[PDB]
Design a protein around this ligand. Structure first.
Ligand SMILES: OC[C@@H]1O[C@@H](O[C@@H]2[C@@H](O)[C@H](O[C@@H]3CO[C@@H](O)[C@H](O)[C@H]3O)OC[C@H]2O)[C@H](O)[C@H]1O
Length: 396
């Protein structure tokens, strides 16, 4: 039925999951005859499920969440994503000007942005003060010193969801961004060239952190977002002082607290600078989430993604997910103090790179993430990370 659509997203729990149900219901109410069938998928399963399903578009989802960067382009090249250049609404064109570039490939728009999530450190202001950290660390050495103080003060300095691999890899991404010159970074990512020494130095700096033993003890078996003992869960329940994460963080924390209300003393600060690094000061890394349409989908799917972009729906999105909506005017309803600081951060950043693994693609990205975990587990080295990336890059 041309008016029945299958909708895949990654909000498997909490208010985010309920938001999509409500949006679907409101869409069905506003467009009688339409039916939205939802599949709420756990984030760590999403890419695998989507890529497998879209090998046969005729039986794949009509509307699905983006993977981002080269991972999107992979799907575009394979004929698994509809060009929406001439399909997106004036509302989207107007309100998502800044974020549409993330969904734009070869001058063509392939999705409707719904959220923007810069990365950085999310921390407990209370645990920081208890360790004698009165100022967020401007530099990496100061961050390391602060971790020592947090450890001495009887808490786990850094929550790390290393079982999911990418949360660990985020430390590596940021260190490369801080170490590599903007030129080397852009060329390295575009050409898949990882020969510059900065790719090794970043690994060595991360190994230094790991050898301080300031992670939560079970970090290798810790997921990012599943349960009270996930890395987000540890931060939410003040069992750990900080974690490096995207700006979806506040909404994940709020559903892992014992009363499932927002974390009271949540603070944010940008990933610090690295002495001797030639990275651009203030450079941002993050993600933009947009929703895509199956090339075989009907106009009903197009209407649904455009419906997401409507100001009221983006405002409800911001409230449900406690994150930054892609729609600029919708950002007015953002109340969380740390999110307001990230928005400012975002508004005057010199540039924003996409998450390194998404920017590099599935093969390199997955190889990189696993290699970072191997080093953190002591079964690998900084050199092995580069070798893993190079090996994977041979396939593309
Ligand atoms: O918009 C609010 C919620 O946040 C997004 O979901 C995020 C998702 O984007 C994130 O993807 C990670 C990003 O880092 C990459 O390195 C990694 O490969 C990738 O898996 O995972 C966390 C999840 O909360 C969605 O827009 C929405 O659920």
């Amino acid at each position: 039925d041309d008016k029945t659509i299958t909708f895949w997203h990654n909000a498997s729990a909490g208010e985010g999951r309920q938001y999509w149900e409500n949006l679907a219901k409101s869409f069905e109410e506003a467009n009688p005859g339409t039916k939205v069938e939802i599949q709420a998928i756990q984030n760590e399963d999403f890419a695998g499920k989507l890529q497998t399903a879209m090998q046969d578009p005729a039986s794949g989802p009509d509307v699905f969440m983006s993977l981002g960067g080269a991972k999107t382009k992979e799907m575009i090249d394979a004929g698994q994503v509809m060009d929406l250049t001439d399909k997106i609404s004036d509302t989207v064109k107007t309100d998502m000007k800044t974020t549409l570039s993330a969904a734009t490939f070869d001058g063509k728009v392939y999705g409707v942005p719904v959220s923007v999530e810069p990365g950085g450190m999310w921390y407990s202001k209370d645990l920081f003060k208890k360790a004698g950290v009165s100022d967020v660390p401007a530099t990496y050495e100061e961050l390391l010193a602060d971790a020592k103080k947090l450890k001495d003060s009887g808490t786990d300095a850094i929550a790390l969801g290393a079982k999911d691999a990418w949360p660990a890899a985020h430390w590596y991404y940021w260190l490369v961004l801080r170490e590599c010159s903007p030129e080397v970074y852009d060329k390295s990512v575009q050409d898949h060239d990882f020969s510059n020494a900065c790719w090794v130095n970043a690994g060595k700096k991360l190994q230094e952190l790991k050898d301080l033993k300031v992670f939560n003890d079970g970090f290798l078996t810790t997921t990012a977002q599943q349960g009270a003992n996930s890395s987000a869960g540890l931060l939410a329940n003040h069992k750990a002082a900080m974690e490096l994460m995207g700006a979806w963080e506040p909404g994940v924390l709020k559903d892992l607290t014992p009363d499932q209300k927002p974390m009271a003393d949540l603070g944010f600060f940008a990933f610090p600078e690295v002495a001797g690094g030639e990275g651009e000061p203030g450079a941002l890394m993050g993600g933009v989430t947009y929703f895509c349409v199956n090339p075989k989908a009907s106009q009903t799917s197009i209407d649904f993604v455009n419906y997401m972009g409507e100001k009221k729906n983006q405002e409800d999105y911001a409230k449900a997910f406690s994150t930054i909506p892609a729609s600029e005017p919708a950002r007015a309803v953002v109340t969380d103090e740390s999110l307001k600081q990230v928005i400012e951060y975002l508004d005057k950043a010199p540039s924003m790179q996409l998450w390194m693994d998404t920017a590099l693609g599935t093969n390199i990205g997955n190889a990189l993430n696993a290699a970072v975990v191997n080093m953190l587990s002591g079964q690998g080295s900084p050199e092995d990370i580069v070798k893993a990336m190079q090996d994977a890059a041979q396939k593309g």
